């Protein structure tokens, strides 16, 4: 019982309200495509290549985002936002994920669990991980927290 | 050998160059949609929201071009622009299209063929459509147009 408390809630429903022996992703990057990216890319596109692009870069993105569940991590606190799409998935993997993490909470959260806070998804590895004997959500007050408990 | 000739070229490759004993699908409608609904419908939602929304579009879109070779369709002629994901399934089911049909070749193409220019692709049915004995791509001096011939 040695911990960080994070005054942000799990991102979505049918995720775990607790999660015993957390191999915990520190994610500096956003698991969301900026709204700006792709109206910029949906503007100078050609009219007709619009939806392969688009179609392109679910996929592309789908792929990435898998890339959590292949390292192994059931917990995935982010600095950044998650989206929908992002969301769905790691709840049906069962991963505990957050968003918009502090960056002072993200850089406790890497000395106290020994993570490494990655930039980019294809730098996620099982090495790049953190531990923690237990990563649960739970009321306090009027507020839902997430506890990182027995950091190791 | 009766028919209408048009200054349109099939919209794809691997497309047929011949089609003998041709069901035409006259659509009046657009076999795309138009950069401003999704830029529009883009920036008007939420940010997180953005992938999800544009996978439902793709999914009813691909359903909506698929009632095409439903309706045994192996022709067809649209007035207006056919997206690029629309020109390779037509392509895949050997449906020879061509796209930015003036209006006046098709009502031409109507009356000669006996087809129903359908305004929604859920009207398209094998009654709405026109018959010919053949229609096929072939170059015209330095110009590549498309012959309906044998209007029945």
Same mark, same amino acid.
Do not use: F, R
């Given at each position: 019982?040695?911990? =960080?408390? =994070? @005054? /942000? %809630? /799990?991102?979505?429903?049918?995720?775990?309200?607790?999660?015993?022996? $957390?191999?915990?992703?520190? =994610? @500096?990057? $956003?698991?969301? =495509?900026?709204?700006? %990216?792709?109206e910029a890319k949906v503007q100078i596109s050609d009219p007709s290549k619009i939806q392969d692009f688009l179609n392109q870069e679910t996929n592309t993105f789908k792929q990435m985002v898998e890339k959590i569940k292949k390292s192994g991590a059931n917990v995935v606190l982010c600095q950044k936002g998650i989206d929908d799409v992002a969301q769905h998935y790691l709840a049906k993997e069962g991963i505990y994920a957050v968003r918009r993490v502090k960056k002072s909470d993200m850089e406790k959260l890497a000395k106290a669990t020994g993570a490494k806070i990655v930039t980019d998804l294809d730098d996620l590895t099982p090495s790049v991980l953190g531990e923690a004997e237990t990563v649960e959500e739970r009321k306090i007050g009027d507020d839902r927290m997430t506890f990182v408990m027995g950091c190791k």
């Open positions: 019982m040695s911990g =960080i408390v =994070i @005054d /942000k %809630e /799990k991102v979505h429903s049918k995720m775990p309200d607790v999660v015993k022996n $957390a191999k915990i992703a520190l =994610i @500096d990057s $956003a698991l969301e =495509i900026k709204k700006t %990216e792709i």
